[PDB]
Design a protein around this motif. Sequence first.
Motif, short mmCIF file in Angstrom:
data_model
loop_
_atom_site.label_atom_id
_atom_site.label_comp_id
_atom_site.label_asym_id
_atom_site.label_seq_id
_atom_site.Cartn_x
_atom_site.Cartn_y
_atom_site.Cartn_z
N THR A 66 40.93 50.78 44.95
CA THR A 66 40.46 49.41 45.04
C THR A 66 39.59 49.23 46.31
OG1 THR A 66 41.28 47.16 44.83
CG2 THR A 66 42.49 48.57 46.35
N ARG A 110 34.20 36.04 44.06
CA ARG A 110 33.51 36.83 43.04
C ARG A 110 32.04 36.56 42.99
NH1 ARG A 110 38.23 36.39 40.00
NH2 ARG A 110 37.46 34.52 38.94
N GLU A 135 42.08 41.93 45.09
CA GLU A 135 41.82 43.36 44.95
C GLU A 135 42.77 44.18 45.80
OE1 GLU A 135 37.58 44.54 44.44
OE2 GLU A 135 37.37 42.33 44.49
N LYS A 184 39.82 46.31 37.97
CA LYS A 184 38.82 45.40 37.43
C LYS A 184 39.20 45.05 36.00
CE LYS A 184 33.75 44.92 36.51
NZ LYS A 184 32.90 45.34 35.34
N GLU A 232 40.16 41.42 34.02
CA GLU A 232 39.44 41.00 32.80
C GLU A 232 40.40 40.81 31.62
OE1 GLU A 232 36.58 44.17 32.62
OE2 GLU A 232 35.35 43.23 34.18
#
Lengths: 321, 321, 321, 321
Positions: free
Chosen positions: D28, D214, D241, D309, D313
């Motif tokens: 990360t 973001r 993260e 990631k 999502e």
Amino acid sequence: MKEALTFDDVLLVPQYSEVLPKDVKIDTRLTRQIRINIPLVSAAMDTVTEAALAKALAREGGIGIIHKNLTPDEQARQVSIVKKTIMSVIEHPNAARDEKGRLLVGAAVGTSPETMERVEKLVKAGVDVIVIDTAHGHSRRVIETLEMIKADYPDLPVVAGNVATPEGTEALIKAGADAVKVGVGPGSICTTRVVAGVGVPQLTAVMECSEVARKYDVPIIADGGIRYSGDIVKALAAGAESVMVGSIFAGTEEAPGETILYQGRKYKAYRGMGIEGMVPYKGTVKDVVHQLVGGLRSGMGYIGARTIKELQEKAVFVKIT
Amino acid sequence: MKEALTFDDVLLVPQYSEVLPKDVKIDTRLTRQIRINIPLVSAAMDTVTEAALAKALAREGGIGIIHKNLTPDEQARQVSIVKKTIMSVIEHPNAARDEKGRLLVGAAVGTSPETMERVEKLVKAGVDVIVIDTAHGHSRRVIETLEMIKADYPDLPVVAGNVATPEGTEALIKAGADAVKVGVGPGSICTTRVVAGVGVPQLTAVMECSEVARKYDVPIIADGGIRYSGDIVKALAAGAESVMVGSIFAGTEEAPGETILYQGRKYKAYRGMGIEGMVPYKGTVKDVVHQLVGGLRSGMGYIGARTIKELQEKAVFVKIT
Amino acid sequence: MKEALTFDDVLLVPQYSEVLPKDVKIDTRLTRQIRINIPLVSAAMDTVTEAALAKALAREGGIGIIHKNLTPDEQARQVSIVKKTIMSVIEHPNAARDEKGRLLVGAAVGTSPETMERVEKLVKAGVDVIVIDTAHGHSRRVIETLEMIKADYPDLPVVAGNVATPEGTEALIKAGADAVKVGVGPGSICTTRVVAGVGVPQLTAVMECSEVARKYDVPIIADGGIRYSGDIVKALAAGAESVMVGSIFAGTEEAPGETILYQGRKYKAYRGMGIEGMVPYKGTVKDVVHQLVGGLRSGMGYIGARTIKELQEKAVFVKIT
Amino acid sequence: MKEALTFDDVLLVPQYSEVLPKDVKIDTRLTRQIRINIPLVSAAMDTVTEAALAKALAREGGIGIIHKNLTPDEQARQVSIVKKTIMSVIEHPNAARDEKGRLLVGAAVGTSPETMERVEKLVKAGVDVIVIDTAHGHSRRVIETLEMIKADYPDLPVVAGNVATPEGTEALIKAGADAVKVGVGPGSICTTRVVAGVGVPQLTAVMECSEVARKYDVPIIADGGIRYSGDIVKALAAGAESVMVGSIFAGTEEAPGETILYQGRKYKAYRGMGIEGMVPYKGTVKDVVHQLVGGLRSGMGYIGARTIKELQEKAVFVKIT
């Protein structure tokens, strides 16, 4: 059915800040005409406030309300002791004083037949503020007592309460209240809730009552359910200009009871209206105030509020589960 | 999915008051034809109500329902004892009496084959009210029992229950119920909920059932989940005209079991339908009633309600977290 | 963000009833092709199900799933013991049997390399149903294992799971599942939730999954979070046709471990996959089933449901706080 | 009034998966320019991170932030120890290293007058990242400190925090933050909440802050309220993260205090900024990381996420009661 929120249901969202905790101002109105230097009022309870506690708190910049479980003579004597309090002066720079330089003090009355007798003697003892101290402020008897006190002593500051609703706050303001004390059934496990089924959670009661009172520039005193200094920030953020506290001051050196040692621990042996008890000893009024004021300052720091008025303008609450 | 509320989910908002707790009237309907002087009915449980408790409560102005874990003969004898009860009269001015001056008393029946046998003997013993006492009132067997009792004894007051839904309340009213007893799964940790997965939280069950019943002027008795006098105010405010209580009376001198001393504390050794136990001793029925009635009066005081009818008209609830 | 509900969040509303608990029918589908006589499946856990428990439950009308913490040979032997079980027959009238008169039994497999080896041996031992027993049923490996088992043994009943979502249920049905086992993170304090942050509260997972499955007439088995017989009524009411239970059967005589006496109390010394323990002894499988079935019958009684299908059609839930 | 959610209020819904826990990638960003191999940052607390813990965690692929309750000289020495750390290399294949092959390490600074002194010495000791470590990141003093550090050391990675609001995150990004640390009042019973009345529940604070960040490709570090490995999955799924953890590492061999034996149990005798204590011994940093990483991998497995990631999502949360 409306949901009502208590202090524990919410948190204040941190905001942009340019002010350090040490530089925030915590002076506030008690009534429309009396200022105190910190937003702390001690409870008119026989386990909390007599002369010794009342003077110890005025010296820190708050105000004590002498309880009414006393004869009118003895209650007046207690007020006199506070009123007749030079390093002693220098060492207490935040001390809340009247226009004559004497420590401020309040006294509780009810609505029973001796009420005017009590009022007269308290006034002659130099009391700064009368608190019409009842669990049900939104009632004929409290309104009439308030009007009678006001008719007889138009210049005497009168706190009336307790109420928990806009209508109650407006009725007491229209009848001459100089401040409205808010708190009916605050505290999840309190007597009023359990015994009577009656209450309004205190965050919501403060917010709706202060909204009415603001229209009249009358200060709201939030009475009850203050456990932690974070509750003070929340109460003041919700629209209160001061907070009345009892249980928190019940453990101090200056509270009426005896300090005792039990199995290596210090306690404050209580004795009220009978009922008897023992709470953990928390130190002096000064120590307790310092922590509370510390926490208030830090909350104000977090919100970027320079003053109590700014705290209320900058307040963003979120509800938590 | 509907959320349903229990007593603990809500509080009553204080309202304008001109009436003192001591001046509120707490007399109420038990059934459409029977009045009691306080809104308290004792549970038809073998740990709660036999003659001694039933008479002690009628004397305070409530009514006991003699339990049915007895032969029809012995249950009738218990009713007779209550019916055949001068300072003794003078000293109990609130006593709930029938048209002949005798203390009121009720008795429970079920829907099993002896039911009519029981009914006949209870009637001849002078019972004032029959309670069709079941956990599931909204059922063929309870409806038919009710219709049979009503066909045979058209003038005999009949409480039917328990139900928790408008449809159940309406079905029992249409079948001749003189009062409807409400309470299926009240109490968070009760048997019905845990074992059967079945219940309706009691505030919501009282409010929806009383709304149907009001259309017919039939009284709702709120049965279950009363822990504190504040629950009575809430139940009555929600539309009930009386409350049935068990566990609260289980600790009194007059409840069926033995009073014992265990390690400096008084207990009431229970023994029901077998199961055995021990609850803290709470005093006499009189003591317990006094506290409950005290709390009811104070709640009514807070709401400004002069009567139970006014309490229901003035009731404003808020939901708390 | 969707709120999801667990069994403890809800209650079933009582409905009009003409059926007594003793007269409700509790027979149900395990898979689209296997019937059991009560809706109880024992967990494929090494603390819960081997031959002794599996036969004790089939005899009561449920079905045990033999756990897979065994060599394929020994797991097959356990199945054989159950399959090769006259007063003994007469005394168990509810016994769940195959088409040949032998007690039904299931066995768990995973998705690891021995899986087909295991399947073959279980089939030859006369297993009635294979359970693809994983915590994450909605995965490539489970789908492919299911398709492989189905391609090789088209007539062999296969339970696949666990899943907690409509998409997962539909994927497993499209791949040939004969029943879908539902339960990912059921139980507030379970490993999956705490360790992985993953779960769906089980009432909501049953309702959304059963809605997909109904379109295909595939039975949902609710696996996990059953603590009380009331949870079974709720699970079945929410759309499940049977319930898998572990911890509840872990305390029975027939569960794998040793029965021991510790300080006047009976316990079941557990020993699983290592980890070791001790749960309170709850009696025989028969005793435990009786209570569970008792509670199911009573819940069905309350709702007026004659059958499990009616229970699902008559189900009205309310959410409680 | 907005409701805000904590990790305990939610669960992740399981999704279709083709990836095994062992095959997910957990590498990360710490800052926009620094990568770590697992998403774990140790707290800049004097009970948590000095050289020994910092090196033990870098070796596992995370990064320690050396606390600032040290003189600038001694804090620099601690950084040097980590920087100047062949089987030793081979045995730690996940080790987080800088561009020169040395273990990564961070150090905390405040906003007090020594700050630049500290920064200079930390930089010369080879520190990889500076953390502006304050409870109130959204403040003039933190912004200016950040701008000063950035003006003087434009290439030095700077974490700034803590914040809990979009506006705070955006202000710190606009002022040059290379990562934003999120966490004001996370933990139900923490000091900030109780004392100041201030906080934002951490799931909501991560989601709203990460949404702003973001837009700028700046990483969010979720700091606080991580009790269980499931909280890490939730924090990372919510948009973080990496996660900063304290109390969890406080019980390890490598944390600053002494390991002691008390009544058959191992403890870690703490000693911070004074205050003193004792937490249960949890093993080595390696052991603790393994469990945490185990739980992260399993959560990722459940959600079918190959990378952090993808986890963000594929994240579907549900709220639970």
